[PDB]
Amino acid sequence: GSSGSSGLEQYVVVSNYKKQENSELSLQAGEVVDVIEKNESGWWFVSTSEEQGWVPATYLEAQNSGPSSG
């Protein structure tokens, strides 16, 4: 694995979100996603190996605790 990830915040799901539209996604409890962007309203844009969609931050948890940045 010598490619070098682009660098995206990987958040872990806490609840099984229920997709409603084509855009929305149906993440599973424990599943891992990649936060691409963020909305002031609270809706975050994540992307999974299957597909990409928009989900609420409430359904996401910060995997990392607090590493020594820099």
Tab-separated table of N, CA, C and O in Angstrom:
chain	number	residue	atom	x	y	z
A	1	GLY	N	0.806	-1.207	0.000
A	1	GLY	CA	0.000	0.000	0.000
A	1	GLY	C	0.842	1.260	0.000
A	1	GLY	O	0.804	2.040	0.951
A	2	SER	N	1.606	1.459	-1.069
A	2	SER	CA	2.466	2.631	-1.186
A	2	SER	C	1.934	3.592	-2.245
A	2	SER	O	2.510	3.725	-3.325
A	3	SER	N	0.829	4.260	-1.928
A	3	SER	CA	0.215	5.206	-2.851
A	3	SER	C	0.095	6.587	-2.214
A	3	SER	O	0.394	7.601	-2.843
A	4	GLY	N	-0.345	6.617	-0.960
A	4	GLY	CA	-0.498	7.878	-0.258
A	4	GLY	C	-1.910	8.422	-0.344
A	4	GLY	O	-2.263	9.099	-1.309
A	5	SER	N	-2.720	8.125	0.667
A	5	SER	CA	-4.104	8.585	0.699
A	5	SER	C	-4.176	10.099	0.527
A	5	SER	O	-3.281	10.827	0.954
A	6	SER	N	-5.251	10.566	-0.101
A	6	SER	CA	-5.440	11.993	-0.333
A	6	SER	C	-5.502	12.755	0.987
A	6	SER	O	-5.051	13.896	1.081
A	7	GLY	N	-6.065	12.114	2.007
A	7	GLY	CA	-6.176	12.745	3.309
A	7	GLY	C	-7.590	13.199	3.616
A	7	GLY	O	-7.952	14.347	3.357
A	8	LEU	N	-8.393	12.295	4.166
A	8	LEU	CA	-9.777	12.607	4.506
A	8	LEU	C	-10.111	12.132	5.916
A	8	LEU	O	-9.657	11.073	6.349
A	9	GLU	N	-10.910	12.922	6.628
A	9	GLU	CA	-11.307	12.582	7.988
A	9	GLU	C	-12.248	11.381	7.997
A	9	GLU	O	-13.396	11.478	7.564
A	10	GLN	N	-11.754	10.251	8.491
A	10	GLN	CA	-12.551	9.032	8.554
A	10	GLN	C	-13.351	8.971	9.852
A	10	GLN	O	-12.786	8.831	10.936
A	11	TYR	N	-14.670	9.078	9.732
A	11	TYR	CA	-15.549	9.038	10.895
A	11	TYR	C	-16.292	7.708	10.971
A	11	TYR	O	-16.627	7.111	9.949
A	12	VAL	N	-16.546	7.249	12.193
A	12	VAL	CA	-17.250	5.990	12.405
A	12	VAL	C	-18.728	6.229	12.698
A	12	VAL	O	-19.083	7.129	13.458
A	13	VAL	N	-19.584	5.417	12.088
A	13	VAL	CA	-21.025	5.539	12.283
A	13	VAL	C	-21.433	5.064	13.674
A	13	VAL	O	-20.796	4.183	14.252
A	14	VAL	N	-22.499	5.652	14.205
A	14	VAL	CA	-22.995	5.289	15.526
A	14	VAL	C	-24.378	4.653	15.440
A	14	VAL	O	-24.765	3.864	16.301
A	15	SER	N	-25.119	5.003	14.393
A	15	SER	CA	-26.461	4.470	14.194
A	15	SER	C	-26.700	4.131	12.727
A	15	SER	O	-26.141	4.766	11.833
A	16	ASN	N	-27.535	3.125	12.485
A	16	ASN	CA	-27.847	2.700	11.126
A	16	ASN	C	-28.812	3.678	10.460
A	16	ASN	O	-30.027	3.586	10.639
A	17	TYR	N	-28.262	4.609	9.689
A	17	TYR	CA	-29.072	5.605	8.997
A	17	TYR	C	-29.940	4.951	7.927
A	17	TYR	O	-29.507	4.029	7.236
A	18	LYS	N	-31.170	5.436	7.794
A	18	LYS	CA	-32.102	4.902	6.807
A	18	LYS	C	-32.211	5.832	5.604
A	18	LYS	O	-32.761	6.929	5.701
A	19	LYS	N	-31.685	5.388	4.467
A	19	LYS	CA	-31.724	6.178	3.243
A	19	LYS	C	-33.164	6.437	2.810
A	19	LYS	O	-34.028	5.571	2.948
A	20	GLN	N	-33.413	7.632	2.285
A	20	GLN	CA	-34.748	8.002	1.830
A	20	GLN	C	-34.746	8.325	0.340
A	20	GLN	O	-35.672	7.961	-0.384
A	21	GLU	N	-33.700	9.009	-0.112
A	21	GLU	CA	-33.579	9.380	-1.516
A	21	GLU	C	-32.335	8.755	-2.140
A	21	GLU	O	-31.591	8.033	-1.477
A	22	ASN	N	-32.114	9.038	-3.420
A	22	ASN	CA	-30.961	8.503	-4.134
A	22	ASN	C	-29.662	9.070	-3.571
A	22	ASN	O	-28.649	8.374	-3.497
A	23	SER	N	-29.699	10.338	-3.176
A	23	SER	CA	-28.524	11.002	-2.623
A	23	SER	C	-28.174	10.433	-1.252
A	23	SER	O	-27.036	10.034	-1.006
A	24	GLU	N	-29.161	10.398	-0.363
A	24	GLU	CA	-28.957	9.879	0.985
A	24	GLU	C	-28.348	8.480	0.942
A	24	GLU	O	-28.500	7.755	-0.041
A	25	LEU	N	-27.658	8.108	2.015
A	25	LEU	CA	-27.025	6.798	2.101
A	25	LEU	C	-27.527	6.029	3.319
A	25	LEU	O	-28.012	6.623	4.283
A	26	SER	N	-27.406	4.707	3.270
A	26	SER	CA	-27.850	3.857	4.369
A	26	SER	C	-26.657	3.240	5.094
A	26	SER	O	-26.376	2.049	4.949
A	27	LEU	N	-25.959	4.057	5.873
A	27	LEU	CA	-24.795	3.594	6.621
A	27	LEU	C	-25.210	2.635	7.733
A	27	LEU	O	-26.333	2.698	8.233
A	28	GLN	N	-24.295	1.751	8.117
A	28	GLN	CA	-24.567	0.780	9.171
A	28	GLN	C	-23.781	1.115	10.434
A	28	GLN	O	-22.673	1.648	10.365
A	29	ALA	N	-24.361	0.800	11.587
A	29	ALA	CA	-23.715	1.066	12.866
A	29	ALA	C	-22.330	0.429	12.925
A	29	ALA	O	-22.193	-0.790	12.822
A	30	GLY	N	-21.307	1.261	13.090
A	30	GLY	CA	-19.947	0.759	13.159
A	30	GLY	C	-19.184	0.975	11.868
A	30	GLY	O	-17.955	1.042	11.869
A	31	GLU	N	-19.913	1.082	10.761
A	31	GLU	CA	-19.296	1.289	9.457
A	31	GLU	C	-18.402	2.526	9.468
A	31	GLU	O	-18.603	3.443	10.263
A	32	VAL	N	-17.413	2.542	8.579
A	32	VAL	CA	-16.489	3.666	8.485
A	32	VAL	C	-16.659	4.409	7.165
A	32	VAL	O	-16.773	3.795	6.105
A	33	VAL	N	-16.676	5.736	7.237
A	33	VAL	CA	-16.830	6.565	6.048
A	33	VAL	C	-15.700	7.582	5.935
A	33	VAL	O	-14.779	7.593	6.752
A	34	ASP	N	-15.777	8.434	4.920
A	34	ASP	CA	-14.761	9.457	4.701
A	34	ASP	C	-15.404	10.825	4.495
A	34	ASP	O	-16.027	11.082	3.464
A	35	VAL	N	-15.248	11.701	5.482
A	35	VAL	CA	-15.813	13.043	5.411
A	35	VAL	C	-15.085	13.890	4.372
A	35	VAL	O	-13.919	14.243	4.551
A	36	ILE	N	-15.781	14.213	3.287
A	36	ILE	CA	-15.201	15.020	2.220
A	36	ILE	C	-15.392	16.509	2.492
A	36	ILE	O	-14.436	17.284	2.451
A	37	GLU	N	-16.631	16.900	2.772
A	37	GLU	CA	-16.946	18.296	3.052
A	37	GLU	C	-17.860	18.415	4.267
A	37	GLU	O	-18.259	17.412	4.858
A	38	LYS	N	-18.189	19.649	4.634
A	38	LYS	CA	-19.058	19.901	5.778
A	38	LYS	C	-19.974	21.092	5.513
A	38	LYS	O	-19.589	22.044	4.836
A	39	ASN	N	-21.187	21.031	6.053
A	39	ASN	CA	-22.157	22.105	5.874
A	39	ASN	C	-22.448	22.800	7.201
A	39	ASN	O	-22.611	22.148	8.232
A	40	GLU	N	-22.511	24.128	7.166
A	40	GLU	CA	-22.782	24.911	8.366
A	40	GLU	C	-24.042	24.412	9.069
A	40	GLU	O	-24.122	24.414	10.298
A	41	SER	N	-25.023	23.985	8.280
A	41	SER	CA	-26.280	23.486	8.826
A	41	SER	C	-26.043	22.264	9.708
A	41	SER	O	-26.762	22.038	10.681
A	42	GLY	N	-25.029	21.479	9.360
A	42	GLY	CA	-24.714	20.289	10.129
A	42	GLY	C	-24.568	19.057	9.258
A	42	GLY	O	-23.941	18.077	9.658
A	43	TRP	N	-25.150	19.106	8.064
A	43	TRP	CA	-25.083	17.984	7.135
A	43	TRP	C	-23.674	17.827	6.572
A	43	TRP	O	-23.131	18.752	5.968
A	44	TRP	N	-23.090	16.652	6.775
A	44	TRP	CA	-21.743	16.374	6.286
A	44	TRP	C	-21.786	15.485	5.048
A	44	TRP	O	-22.667	14.635	4.911
A	45	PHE	N	-20.829	15.685	4.147
A	45	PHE	CA	-20.758	14.902	2.920
A	45	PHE	C	-19.723	13.788	3.044
A	45	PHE	O	-18.518	14.040	3.027
A	46	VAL	N	-20.203	12.555	3.172
A	46	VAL	CA	-19.319	11.401	3.299
A	46	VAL	C	-19.314	10.569	2.022
A	46	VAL	O	-20.181	10.727	1.162
A	47	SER	N	-18.330	9.683	1.903
A	47	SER	CA	-18.210	8.828	0.728
A	47	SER	C	-17.776	7.420	1.123
A	47	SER	O	-16.773	7.237	1.815
A	48	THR	N	-18.539	6.425	0.680
A	48	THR	CA	-18.235	5.033	0.986
A	48	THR	C	-17.837	4.267	-0.269
A	48	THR	O	-18.075	4.723	-1.388
A	49	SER	N	-17.232	3.099	-0.079
A	49	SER	CA	-16.798	2.271	-1.197
A	49	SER	C	-17.964	1.970	-2.134
A	49	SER	O	-17.780	1.822	-3.342
A	50	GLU	N	-19.163	1.882	-1.568
A	50	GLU	CA	-20.359	1.598	-2.352
A	50	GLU	C	-20.802	2.832	-3.134
A	50	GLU	O	-20.785	2.838	-4.364
A	51	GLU	N	-21.200	3.873	-2.409
A	51	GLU	CA	-21.649	5.112	-3.034
A	51	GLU	C	-21.383	6.308	-2.125
A	51	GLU	O	-20.893	6.153	-1.008
A	52	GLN	N	-21.709	7.499	-2.615
A	52	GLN	CA	-21.504	8.722	-1.848
A	52	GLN	C	-22.826	9.445	-1.610
A	52	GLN	O	-23.711	9.436	-2.465
A	53	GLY	N	-22.952	10.070	-0.444
A	53	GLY	CA	-24.169	10.788	-0.115
A	53	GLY	C	-23.976	11.763	1.029
A	53	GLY	O	-22.864	11.931	1.530
A	54	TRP	N	-25.060	12.409	1.442
A	54	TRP	CA	-25.004	13.375	2.535
A	54	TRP	C	-25.733	12.848	3.766
A	54	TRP	O	-26.870	12.384	3.675
A	55	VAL	N	-25.073	12.923	4.917
A	55	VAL	CA	-25.658	12.455	6.166
A	55	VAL	C	-25.382	13.432	7.304
A	55	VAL	O	-24.425	14.206	7.271
A	56	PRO	N	-26.237	13.397	8.336
A	56	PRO	CA	-26.105	14.271	9.504
A	56	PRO	C	-24.899	13.911	10.365
A	56	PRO	O	-24.574	12.735	10.534
A	57	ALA	N	-24.239	14.929	10.908
A	57	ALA	CA	-23.069	14.718	11.752
A	57	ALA	C	-23.427	13.898	12.987
A	57	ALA	O	-22.583	13.194	13.544
A	58	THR	N	-24.683	13.993	13.413
A	58	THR	CA	-25.150	13.261	14.584
A	58	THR	C	-24.928	11.761	14.419
A	58	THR	O	-24.800	11.033	15.403
A	59	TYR	N	-24.883	11.308	13.172
A	59	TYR	CA	-24.678	9.894	12.880
A	59	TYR	C	-23.208	9.605	12.592
A	59	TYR	O	-22.877	8.668	11.864
A	60	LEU	N	-22.328	10.416	13.171
A	60	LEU	CA	-20.892	10.249	12.979
A	60	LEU	C	-20.132	10.543	14.269
A	60	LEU	O	-20.493	11.448	15.020
A	61	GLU	N	-19.078	9.773	14.518
A	61	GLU	CA	-18.267	9.952	15.716
A	61	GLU	C	-16.785	10.044	15.362
A	61	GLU	O	-16.303	9.336	14.479
A	62	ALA	N	-16.070	10.921	16.058
A	62	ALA	CA	-14.644	11.105	15.820
A	62	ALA	C	-13.846	9.903	16.310
A	62	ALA	O	-13.638	9.733	17.511
A	63	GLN	N	-13.402	9.071	15.373
A	63	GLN	CA	-12.627	7.882	15.712
A	63	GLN	C	-11.413	8.247	16.560
A	63	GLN	O	-11.206	7.689	17.636
A	64	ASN	N	-10.615	9.189	16.068
A	64	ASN	CA	-9.421	9.627	16.780
A	64	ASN	C	-9.793	10.385	18.051
A	64	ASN	O	-10.818	11.064	18.104
A	65	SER	N	-8.953	10.262	19.074
A	65	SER	CA	-9.195	10.933	20.346
A	65	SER	C	-8.544	12.312	20.366
A	65	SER	O	-9.204	13.318	20.626
A	66	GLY	N	-7.244	12.351	20.088
A	66	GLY	CA	-6.525	13.611	20.080
A	66	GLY	C	-5.027	13.422	19.950
A	66	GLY	O	-4.275	13.571	20.913
A	67	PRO	N	-4.573	13.085	18.733
A	67	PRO	CA	-3.150	12.868	18.451
A	67	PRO	C	-2.345	14.162	18.501
A	67	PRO	O	-2.908	15.256	18.491
A	68	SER	N	-1.024	14.029	18.556
A	68	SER	CA	-0.140	15.188	18.611
A	68	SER	C	0.137	15.727	17.211
A	68	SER	O	1.129	15.362	16.579
A	69	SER	N	-0.746	16.597	16.733
A	69	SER	CA	-0.600	17.184	15.406
A	69	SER	C	0.639	18.071	15.338
A	69	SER	O	0.932	18.821	16.269
A	70	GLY	N	1.364	17.981	14.227
A	70	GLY	CA	2.563	18.780	14.057
A	70	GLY	C	3.794	18.110	14.634
A	70	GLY	O	4.833	18.746	14.808
